[PDB]
Amino acid sequence: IQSLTARAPVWLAAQDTLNQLCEQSGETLASSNDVTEYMQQLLEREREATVERDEVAAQKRELEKQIERLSQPSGAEDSRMIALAERFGGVLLSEIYDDITIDDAPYFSALYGPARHGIVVPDLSLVRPHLETLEDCPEDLYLIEGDPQSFDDSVFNAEEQTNAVLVKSSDRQWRYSRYPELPLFGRAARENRLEALNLERDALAERYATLSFDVQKIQRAHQAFSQFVGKHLSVAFDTDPEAEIRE
Amino acid sequence: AIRVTQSDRDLFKHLITEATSYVSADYMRHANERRTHLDEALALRGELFGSHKQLATEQYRHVEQEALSLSVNEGGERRMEMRQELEQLKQKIQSLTARAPVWLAAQDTLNQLCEQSGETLASSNDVTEYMQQLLEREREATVERDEVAAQKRELEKQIERLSQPSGAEDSRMIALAERFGGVLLSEIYDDITIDDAPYFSALYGPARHGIVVPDLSLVRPHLETLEDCPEDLYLIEGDPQSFDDSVFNAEEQTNAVLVKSSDRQWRYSRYPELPLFGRAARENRLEALNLERDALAERYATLSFDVQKIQRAHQAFSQFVGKHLSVAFDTDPEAEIRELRQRHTELEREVSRFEDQTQQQRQQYAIAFCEAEMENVQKKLRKLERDYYQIREQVVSAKAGWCAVMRMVKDNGVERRLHRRELAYMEGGALRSMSDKALGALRLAVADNEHLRDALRLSEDPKRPERKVQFFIAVYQHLRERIRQDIIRTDDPVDAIEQMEIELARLTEELTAREQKLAI
Numbered sequence: 001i002q003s004l005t006a007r008a009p010v011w012l013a014a015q016d017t018l019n020q021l022c023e024q025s026g027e028t029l030a031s032s033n034d035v036t037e038y039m040q041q042l043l044e045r046e047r048e049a050t051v052e053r054d055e056v057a058a059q060k061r062e063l064e065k066q067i068e069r070l071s072q073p074s075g076a077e078d079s080r081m082i083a084l085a086e087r088f089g090g091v092l093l094s095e096i097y098d099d100i101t102i103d104d105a106p107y108f109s110a111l112y113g114p115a116r117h118g119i120v121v122p123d124l125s126l127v128r129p130h131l132e133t134l135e136d137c138p139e140d141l142y143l144i145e146g147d148p149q150s151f152d153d154s155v156f157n158a159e160e161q162t163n164a165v166l167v168k169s170s171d172r173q174w175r176y177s178r179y180p181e182l183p184l185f186g187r188a189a190r191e192n193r194l195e196a197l198n199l200e201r202d203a204l205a206e207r208y209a210t211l212s213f214d215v216q217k218i219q220r221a222h223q224a225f226s227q228f229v230g231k232h233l234s235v236a237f238d239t240d241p242e243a244e245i246r247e
Numbered sequence: 248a249i250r251v252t253q254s255d256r257d258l259f260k261h262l263i264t265e266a267t268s269y270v271s272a273d274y275m276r277h278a279n280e281r282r283t284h285l286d287e288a289l290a291l292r293g294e295l296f297g298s299h300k301q302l303a304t305e306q307y308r309h310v311e312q313e314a315l316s317l318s319v320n321e322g323g324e325r326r327m328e329m330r331q332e333l334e335q336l337k338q339k340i341q342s343l344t345a346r347a348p349v350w351l352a353a354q355d356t357l358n359q360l361c362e363q364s365g366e367t368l369a370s371s372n373d374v375t376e377y378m379q380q381l382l383e384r385e386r387e388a389t390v391e392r393d394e395v396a397a398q399k400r401e402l403e404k405q406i407e408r409l410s411q412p413s414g415a416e417d418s419r420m421i422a423l424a425e426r427f428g429g430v431l432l433s434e435i436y437d438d439i440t441i442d443d444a445p446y447f448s449a450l451y452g453p454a455r456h457g458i459v460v461p462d463l464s465l466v467r468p469h470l471e472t473l474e475d476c477p478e479d480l481y482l483i484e485g486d487p488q489s490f491d492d493s494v495f496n497a498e499e500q501t502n503a504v505l506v507k508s509s510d511r512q513w514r515y516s517r518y519p520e521l522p523l524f525g526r527a528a529r530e531n532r533l534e535a536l537n538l539e540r541d542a543l544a545e546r547y548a549t550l551s552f553d554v555q556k557i558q559r560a561h562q563a564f565s566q567f568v569g570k571h572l573s574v575a576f577d578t579d580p581e582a583e584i585r586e587l588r589q590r591h592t593e594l595e596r597e598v599s600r601f602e603d604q605t606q607q608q609r610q611q612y613a614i615a616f617c618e619a620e621m622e623n624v625q626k627k628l629r630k631l632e633r634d635y636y637q638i639r640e641q642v643v644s645a646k647a648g649w650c651a652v653m654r655m656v657k658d659n660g661v662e663r664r665l666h667r668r669e670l671a672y673m674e675g676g677a678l679r680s681m682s683d684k685a686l687g688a689l690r691l692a693v694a695d696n697e698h699l700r701d702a703l704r705l706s707e708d709p710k711r712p713e714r715k716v717q718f719f720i721a722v723y724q725h726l727r728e729r730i731r732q733d734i735i736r737t738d739d740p741v742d743a744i745e746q747m748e749i750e751l752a753r754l755t756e757e758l759t760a761r762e763q764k765l766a767i
Binding site: 146161 | 371372375376378379380382383386389390393397452453454463466470471473474476478479480481482483484485493494495500501502503505508509510511512513514515516517519561562565568569572663668669671672745748749752753756757765767
């Protein structure tokens with residue numbers, strides 16, 4: 001009886017913690033080996049939930065980058081283009097076409113092709129001395145000559161076709177552009193599309209929040225089991241002393 | 248957000264703890280008091296009844312060579328007492344002996360397992376501490392090997408993206424080059440030197456991917472028929488077999504090229520790397536990616552091996568605590584067995600002395616007061632009977648209140664929150680100490696509120712126990728109103744603590760960094 005009495009309180013404390021722990025989980029534990037196998041299942045759920053979390057994170061990053069490209073001032077390769085626009089006596093072409101309607105936007109975007117985001121500069125010889133200094137610029141910079149305030153349609157050997165445009169860029173060179181949807185120019189409704197993108201990104205943020213919460217829950221559950229075994233196994237799953245003392 | 252949640256968690260966690268301790272300790276003290284009352288009642292009842300019948304029987308009776316026996320009866324009993332003690336001592340030695348090889352095996356495998364581990368073990372709780380450290384390290388290792396596997400998947404995806412021949416080329420463009428007399432431009436300059444390749448790629452710009460068609464008469468009729476083609480198709484006129492320099496008014500700058508593309512149009516480009524021309528299969532890049540992939544594979548292999556080692560050590564410890572923990576770190580039983588052998592010897596000497604002494608000894612040797620005293624015991628019986636009567640009223644009256652408290656407590660408190668059954672094996676002094684210190688904390692915690700303050704005030708009369716549980720109920724309801732279920736859903740605050748903890752961890756993780764800072 002003295003031995004059982006000395007042993008009892010430790011076993012009782014251990015049992016309370018064990019009951020709380022297993023009830024906190026869906027599965028009921030019965031032995032040391034059982035607890036270990038539950039550890040392993042917990043690890044597998046960690047490493048699955050984390051993969052979904054990371055993939056959703058990748059989508060969210062892509063969405064923010066896409067939204068950000070359409071932001072300012074007239075959405076373009078804004079990193080250097082604004083400074084490059086003022087360092088010459090020119091104006092950004094996409095900014096000149098800020099006001100165009102949605103109906104002509106796809107046509108113009110097909111027409112100008114890669115040069116949509118070039119700069120208008122009426123001489124193009126004043127840049128020739130400056131040019132050697134351009135070490136910080138997009139890998140392909142486009143320059144056009146004309147009046148920035150009342151720029152005339154750049155002389156293109158253009159030719160309209162069904163839902164596409166043909167152009168002779170140079171002697172022995174032609175480009176053929178198909179009408180895109182939701183273009184660059186006409187940056188009035190392109191705010192409409194970035195509004196759609198904001199609506200899209202809201203859902204990704206919500207879903208990512210839930211997934212991160214789940215991962216944290218799993219991690220803390222593993223922490224709880226580790227703390228438990230650190231403080232608990234010495235008397236875990238042993239026979240009940242109340243019964244034997246009563247006997 | 249982290250600030251607000253921190254404040255809420257601190258408040259909940261402290262107030263709930265003090266309320267729970269203050270209430271539960273008193274509850275258990277009452278349980279123990281009732282047990283003591285029942286024990287006292289049964290003991291005094293037992294001896295009262297027994298003495299009563301004895302007194303009745305003694306009243307009925309009341310109304311109605313020598314040294315050989317003593318010397319042999321005592322001597323024989325003494326040796327016999329020691330015969331039984333010898334058997335005990337024998338049984339004690341037998342128990343210690345049955346436990347001896349078990350202990351020795353425990354120590355042996357303990358030393359072996361200790362040496363298998365870097366850290367040295369000295370106590371049971373120390374062993375379990377080391378075990379949880381091992382689990383922690385195992386979890387970290389498996390996380391790292393998973394990370395490396397993910398990066399190796401990324402590299403393998405990048406290499407797979409080098410579909411054909413080494414670095415993917417769009418087959419649709421090959422079909423288009425088949426549909427018009429001509430050849431793909433990159434296919435024409437795919438073999439130019441790597442030194443000049445960046446220069447050429449800068450020269451051609453977007454037109455790098457295009458078809459060399461020397462006629463330009465086949466396309467125009469077929470142009471309106473093209474729908475699957477890339478959105479920006481490029482075409483150039485020249486001999487595919489011996490392709491003359493394309494018309495560029497190209498002028499070479501430092502690490503860049505300038506091209507007068509058209510009237511009123513110049514195009515400026517800088518030198519890239521991985522040029523579309525001069526590919527030569529760019530096998531060197533494929534091999535650099537293979538080198539990186541193989542480095543990742545090797546790192547993954549090492550981490551997998553390490554995790555396997557850790558798991559094996561874990562299983563060893565699980566088995567040990569499954570089969571030797573009961574005897575781990577105990578002392579050597581042989582010393583105690585030796586001591587009991589000395590006791591056997593003295594016992595055998597004493598047995599010999601009594602056997603000899605009894606042998607020699609047996610060989611040479613071979614009412615008015617009772618009534619008066621007993622009537623006072625009868626009157627003692629009467630006094631004891633009224634004492635029993637008092638105790639009995641105490642017991643029944645106490646149960647009447649236990650009934651009510653256990654009726655009200657069934658609002659989930661008794662399940663495990665108030666019934667802190669650990670406390671049943673403690674004396675009342677410790678219970679009161681805990682209750683008093685908990686009350687000291689509560690007075691400060693509850694200082695501002697008035698409802699809770701009134702309830703706590705009412706609770707401190709020992710003669711009305713249900714008041715304390717009512718105070719507990721007030722606390723729980725008060726907390727439930729403050730949960731702010733916009734972000735939390737559990738109604739039980741005690742369970743809500745875990746959700747506040749999770750929120751703190753997640754918010755601290757979101758706080759990390761973005762650093763994509765660049766603007767006008």
